Amino acid sequence: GLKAAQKTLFPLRSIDDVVRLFAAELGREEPDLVLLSLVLGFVEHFLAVNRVGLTYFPVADLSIIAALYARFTAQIRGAVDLSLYPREGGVSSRELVKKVSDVIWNSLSRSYFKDRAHIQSLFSFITGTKLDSSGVAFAVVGACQALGLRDVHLALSEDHAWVVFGPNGEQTAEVTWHGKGNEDRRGQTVNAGVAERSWLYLKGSYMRCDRKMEVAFMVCAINPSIDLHTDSLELLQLQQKLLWLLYDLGHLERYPMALGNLADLEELEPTPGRPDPLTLYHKGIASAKTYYRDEHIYPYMYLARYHCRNRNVREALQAWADTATVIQDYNYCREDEEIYKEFFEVANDVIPNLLKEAASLLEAGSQGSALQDPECFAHLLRFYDGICKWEEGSPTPVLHVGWATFLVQSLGRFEGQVRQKVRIVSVPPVLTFQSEKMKGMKELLVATKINSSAIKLQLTAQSQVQMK
C-alpha cells in the first residue's frame, strides 16, 4: 500500500507540485519507484500523447494515481509468490528475478511497435500493456521494490539495461530484450558480453544504480516529443527541473548521460544562475573518467554534437577524436551496431557537411579556419585512427570502401601545406597512431593531391586493383 505520508501533496496541480513530490520521495529511506513512474507517465500521457482538454496542467488526483498503483501492486503480488523463493540472507535469488521478469513480459501485448515513444513508464504498462526494452527492466526493478527486494537494482550500459542483485549486489541478470532480431538471454549473466569486450557491456564499466539513480533514470526517460516537429514545453520544463533537483542532491554524480541530457536542456532554455551547457558536458565526461574508467562513448558524443550545432569545427573534431580514442580499446561485436551506426554517420555525413561549409567560408576569406589549422587535421586523423584500432582484433570488420570515399574527400579539404605540418611520430603538432592501418597511410597523408586508390587500398581489406 501507499503510505499516508506519500499521499499528502496530492492533488498535483502543476510542474512545481510534481517536483515537490520528487523532492519528498528522494528525502525518504527508499523513493517509491512505482509511485514516481506512474505520476510521470500520467502527466506525460496528458501532455504529449493526448492534450485534448488541456488548459494548464493535467491535475493528478490521488484517487486516479492510487488506483493505478493498486493495479500494479495487485498484479505483481498475485503473480509472484515469495514463499516459493526464500530470501537466503536478505538477498534475492536468480529464480525470483527471473519470475518477476516473466510476470512483466507475459503481461505485455502480443504484438506492438517496440520503438514507439511514450511506452517507457508504468503508466504505459498498466493502461496499454506496452513497454519498450529498458522500460521492462525498470518495471522489474519497481516490481522488486514493491515486493521488498531491496537488493535488486537497475544496471545500464549505453545501449541496454538489465539488473544486479544478490550477495553484495554481485550478480547480474538479463531481464529484457536487446535490439531487434538478437538472441534472447533472459535469466543469464552479462559475463560473456563483458569478457568479449563489446561496447554493449562496456567492459564491465556499466552503471550500477542505487534507488536515487533509478529515479534519475525515469526522469531521463521522460519523452517530451508530441510529434516529429513539436515538443511539450511543459515536459521539457519538468524534466529540466527534476534533473536540477537530482543534480543538487548529488544523484547525477555517477550518471554521465543524465548530465549530457541536462546540458542539452540548458542549451534549449537556460536556467539563470546555473552552469553553462559546456560546463555540464565536461562534468559528464569527468563523471565517466572518475567512475567508469573513461570507457563511455556518449559523454564525448554529447560534447561533439554541441560543438557541431554551434558550428565550432575545431572543438567538434577534437571531441569526435576523443570518442574514437575510447572506442579503440573495444572489440566490435554482433550487438554493437548502434555505435557503428553513430560512428558511420559522423564520418560519412556530419564531418563531410561541416568541412563542406568550412571550405565555402575559407573561400570567402575566413580567418582561424579549422581547415588551416594542422591541429584540426590531427583530430581528423586521430578519429580515423581510433576507428581502425577498434577494428583490430574484432570478430566483425568495421571499415569498407564506402568509408574510403568520404575519407579521401575529408582529407582533401585540408591543403597539402596544412597537412604537412602534422608530424606523425612512432612509438618507439604531433600525433601518434595506434592502428596499423593509419601507420601505413602516413606517407599518403601529405601529398599535394591525395592518392585515392592508394588510400582506399590501405583503409580496406581490398589488396588488388581491377584486372583490365
Residue numbers in the entry: 2 to 53, 74 to 386, 399 to 459, 537 to 538, 549 to 588
Quote the passages of the study that discuss this structure, keeping the authors' original sentences:
pmcMenin, a 67 kDa protein encoded by the MEN1 (Multiple Endocrine Neoplasia 1) gene, is a chromatin adaptor protein that interacts with MLL1 (Mixed Lineage Leukemia 1, also known as KMT2A) to regulate the expression of multiple genes, including HOXA cluster genes. Menin has been identified as an essential oncogenic co-factor of MLL1 fusion proteins found in acute leukemia patients. MBM1 binds to the central cavity of menin, utilizing Phe9, Pro10, and Pro13 as energetic hotspots, which occupy well-defined hydrophobic pockets, and positively charged arginine residues (Arg8 and Arg12) that are involved in electrostatic interactions with the negatively charged binding site on menin. Importantly, recent clinical studies found emerging resistance to Revumenib treatment and patient relapse as a result of somatic mutations in MEN1, leading to point mutations of T349M, M327I/V, and G331R/D. Understanding how these mutations affect menin structure as well as the interaction with MLL1 and current menin inhibitors will be crucial in the development of a new generation of inhibitors maintaining their activity against menin mutants.
We also solved the crystal structures of these menin mutants, showing no structural changes in the MLL1 binding site on menin. We found that point mutations in menin do not change the protein structure and only minimally perturb menin residues surrounding the MBM1 binding site. In contrast to the predictions from computational studies, the crystal structures of the menin mutants revealed that these point mutations have no impact on menin structure or stability. We have also calculated the electrostatic potential for the wild-type, G331R, and G331D menin variants and found that in all cases the MBM1 site on menin has a strong negative charge that is minimally perturbed by either of the two G331 mutations. On the contrary, mutations of G331 to arginine or aspartate perturb the charge in the MLL1 binding site on menin, resulting in decreased MBM1 binding affinity. First, we tested competition with MLL1160 and found very similar IC50 values for wild-type menin and the three mutants M327I, T349M, and G331R, ranging between 4.1 and 8 nM. However, activity against menin mutants is significantly reduced, from 5-fold for G331R to over 100-fold for M327I. Our structural analysis clearly shows that all these point mutations exhibit a steric clash with the menin inhibitor Revumenib, overlapping with inhibitor fragments that extend beyond the Pro13 binding pocket on menin.
